[PDB]
Structures are given as C-alpha cells and as structure tokens.
Paper text:
Aminoglycoside resistance is commonly conferred by enzymatic modification of drugs by aminoglycoside-modifying enzymes such as aminoglycoside nucleo­tidyltransferases (ANTs). Still, the S. enterica genome contains an aadA gene encoding an ANT enzyme. AadA is an ANT(3′′)(9) streptomycin/spectinomycin adenyltransferase encoded by the aadA gene that adenylates the 3′′-hydroxyl group of the streptomycin glucosamine ring and the 9-hydroxyl group of the spectinomycin actinamine ring. AadA catalyses the magnesium-dependent transfer of adenosine monophosphate from ATP to the two chemically dissimilar drugs streptomycin and spectinomycin. AadA consists of a nucleotidyltransferase domain and an α-helical bundle domain.
Here, the first crystal structure of an ANT(3′′)(9) adenyltransferase, AadA from Salmonella enterica, is presented. Trials to perform molecular replacement using search models with low sequence identity failed, and the structure was solved using SAD phasing with selenomethionine-substituted AadA crystals. The final model contains residues 3–262 and only lacks the first two N-terminal residues and the His tag. The loop regions 97–103 and 235–240 display weak density, indicating flexibility. The N-terminal domain (residues 3–157) forms a nucleotidyltransferase fold according to the SCOP database and has a central five-stranded mixed β-sheet surrounded by six α-helices. The C-terminal domain (residues 158–262) consists of five α-helices forming an up-and-down α-helical bundle. AadA crystallizes as a monomer and is a monomer in solution as confirmed by small-angle X-ray scattering, in contrast to structurally similar homodimeric adenylating enzymes such as kanamycin nucleotidyltransferase. In the AadA structure, several of the residues predicted to participate in ATP binding are involved in interactions with the C-terminal domain: Ser36 forms a hydrogen bond to Asp206, Ser46 hydrogen-bonds to the amino group of Lys43, and Asp47 and Asp49 form salt bridges with Lys205. Thus, in the conformation observed in the apo AadA structure the nucleotide-binding site is blocked by interdomain inter­actions.
Numbering used by the authors: 3 to 262
Write the structure that this text describes.
Amino acid sequence: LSIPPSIQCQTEAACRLITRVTGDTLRAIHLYGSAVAGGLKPNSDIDLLVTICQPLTEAQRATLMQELLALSSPPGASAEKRALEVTVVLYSQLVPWCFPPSREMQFGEWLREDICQGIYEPAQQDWDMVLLITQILETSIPLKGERAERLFTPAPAAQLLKALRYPLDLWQSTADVQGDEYHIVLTLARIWYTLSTGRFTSKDAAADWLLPQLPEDYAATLRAAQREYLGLEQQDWHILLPAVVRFVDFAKAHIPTQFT
C-alpha cells in the first residue's frame, strides 16, 4: 500500500506543516481516500486524519487553516495541486470512544471563502468520525506515527448502525433536500452500500455497486451524481430536484435497517 508519486510532494508539505504547528501534541497523521483506494482521478482530494493529544490554541487553529488553504486549491483547478481535506481529532475522543465524538477541526475547499474572511468553524460533534475511524481501519497509510490498526479501537456494531443511519432523519421533506441534492444522493448510495456490504470505505465504490440493482428511473439519478463526482460532467441539480426527492423516498424505503 503505497503513496502515489504524483501526490508525494503535496502530501509531504502538509505533513511538515502539520507537525510544525502541532509540535508536541501530534500523535499521528493518516492518509486515506482515493489516494489509497479506488485510484486517483483528476478531481480527487488528498485526505488526512490528524490525531492530537491536547486541543489547539486559537493561534494554531488560525495558522493551520490559513496554511492549509495555501497548500490547497479547488478540485480541478491546477495540475500539481490537489484539494486537501484535513480532520483534526482528539485522541481522548477515540480512545475511549465518545459517542458521537467531537472533531477538533476540519479543513476543506468548502471553507475557502469562510477562511478568507478569517471565519474558522469550532470543534463539534460528528457522527461521521465513527465512520471515518472505521474507514481508516480498513485502508490507510500512517504518514506519521502508528498504523491505525494499532492506534484505534472499533466501534461497537450498534454505534456503526447509528452513525450510518443518522443522516436519514435529516431529510424529511423537500425543503430538507432542496439545496443539498448532489451530496444527499451520493450519501444515500454510500449508506446503502456500507450497510449491505459491510464495507466502510464507500466513496468510489457505492454508486457502481448500486446502479445495477436500481430500476432505471432511479439509476438515472444516481448515474448523474456519480458522473459529477468523477468530474466528467456537471448537472443542474435544481431542475433534478423532483427526481432526487423520488430518489430519497425510494432509498429510505429500501435501505437496510441492519447489516447484511
């Protein structure tokens, strides 16, 4: 399990930046995502988990967000510079597990304008953490420190069910769905996929797995989302809203209530 050469230099720069700002409290830095599974696409992001022992000073938070922003560019912006996603989490939140755990910090290109404004979102509870940790137990490269397998504990099956199904109650109505249709459709495919196959690294696999099992009506909707994810075509998701709403309902009806 190796790091693709093409991201080798960008990954090292973030690593040295993180180690620099974090200094002592740094426990581990894990690489995950398309870079280790599914293969890189022009639009893939480099994904890092940063495990730390104590919380960040506001100064450090500010330094990290600013400097990451600099080492990152929007996906499909430039060759030689890829979108970064960086999640900082307190060791004490994973070991022992707090449910849901808080994440200390998150960087991503969706924060670029907020960061330009000097707006830095604070620590908060994220059920996705449970998913994330479980995901990196399946596949990750330990860029700094111990391998995930040694460092992190599962995640009782019950909580995994809780964390996967949690987003389902986010979308009751059309208004819930209205501006998030692209994210929702892919998330629904991911949840269905993981619940069915038991496999938590879902981002590249889910759609391809599910599409053959979908009646054409819904497959058409999932297909557009995938194709947008792959970055080979972009869709106007506002016109696709009613087909997405239908997708949601059909998905809530058939998505497993338990692990197969």
